[PDB]
Design a protein around this ligand. Sequence first.
Ligand SMILES: O=C(O)CC[C@@H](NCC(=O)[C@H](O)[C@H](O)[C@@H](O)CO)C(=O)O
Ligand SMILES: [Mg+2]
Ligand SMILES: [Mg+2]
Length: 493
Amino acid sequence: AKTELSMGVASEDVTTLDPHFATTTSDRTLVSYIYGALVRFAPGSANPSSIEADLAESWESNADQLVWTFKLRPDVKWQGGYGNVTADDVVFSLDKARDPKRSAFSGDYAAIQKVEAVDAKTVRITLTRRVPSLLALLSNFSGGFIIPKKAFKERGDDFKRRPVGFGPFQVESIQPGQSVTLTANAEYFRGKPKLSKISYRFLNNEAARDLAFESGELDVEQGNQDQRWLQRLTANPENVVDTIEPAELNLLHINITKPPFNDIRVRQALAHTVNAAQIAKYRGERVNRAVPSVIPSNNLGFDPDAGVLNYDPAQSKKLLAEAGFPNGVTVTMVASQLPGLESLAQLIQAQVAEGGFTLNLQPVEHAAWHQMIRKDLSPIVLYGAARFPIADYYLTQFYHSASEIGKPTQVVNFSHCNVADKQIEAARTETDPNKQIELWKEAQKLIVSNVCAIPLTENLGTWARKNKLGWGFELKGSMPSAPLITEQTYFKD
Ligand SMILES: O=C(O)CC[C@@H](NCC(=O)[C@H](O)[C@H](O)[C@@H](O)CO)C(=O)O
Ligand SMILES: [Mg+2]
Ligand SMILES: [Mg+2]
């Protein structure tokens, strides 16, 4: 049939298409269409078990698994005429990914010692110690994507809006705040895409997005976490709703160094007046689930019994009075305008009033909000995300003190947590599998009991499409929790 795909997303604009910085779901989704990596998750899977060849046609490790040699596919071409992808591009990209001055994801690569071009088609990666999940680090997510040395060196600060990858689609143009026009990479190494163009539309307003989808302007539209939207879409036999793994866990990360939240009783009071099970029941159990820990349930090392504080708003009021707040606590939070996070913050705002908290929400456009929270501008941060499914990733990034906002090594530790550093570090390199699991669980119990963060629900990604669109594979998951459009995506007659 037709070869042009139109999709409506919950975003206001592009922030960065440099894969070493792209963090919002929208920027990560675009990056997943433009770039590739040495290896990749199988299309339609978010599980590292599925990892398969991408730019690297084969690889091997030495006996001690400290030296890995990747053999590159010969004639993989960059978009825009930058020529053949070489080992020098891989060295440049991985060294950039592992540099805290040029990447938002450098901490994931701390165990890489060196990356060397043995020849134009051979890359040698030497590790400081064994890294069981190395292939996930080298895959098509976060810092694994490969970029062109020549394009980045020249474009510099403009590369983020004029990206160049070897993926199936290229950015032809950006219409700021309206859309991104992507076109098929005619030289894509797996074959020319069946789609000729993608019109990626910024439709943050849910009512306008739904109207564009029902009027036939969109072939795909991002949904939300509400079962009511899910039921209204599934009612039309022409629509298909995809619920996409991994589930992103939402937490209230509390800055434990800032009064009044430096008193554990105040944090405990907040935790006793949130009700994640009620949010999950309201939003719907197919897409949403309350999580009994501070990392997503789909993690090796997840603790189903971390000790999450129960709902008891009478106890919240008692604790606030003991802490010197007989008339309650008021707090202003900088809150994202991404509709799912905005509606979640509004649900929490209503819940916490029962226990004596009056939450004032200062709304900020999503990408601007991401910048503000990373400047330590909010006392509490409602953040929702998933990472590779090994506890070390979520724990290190959100809760290890090295990740604390304000440090050169900062990641997403908005709570300024430091209570679990020794357990996180010991678990990371523990070779006894059961002991490693127990150290990850001990870290979760400490973070929960000190109330550095309060878990809410985790939600699968929700997207609607017309049944005339075929992905070319089963869309079970995608690391950004969004559809993956590839050279296989097609329309039916
Ligand atoms: O990877 C990251 O660090 C950020 C993840 C990215 N995910 C969107 C997100 O927070 C979730 O969809 C979120 O769980 C809300 O919509 C909850 O209703 C973000 O754009 O903020
Ligand atoms: Mg955005
Ligand atoms: Mg902590």
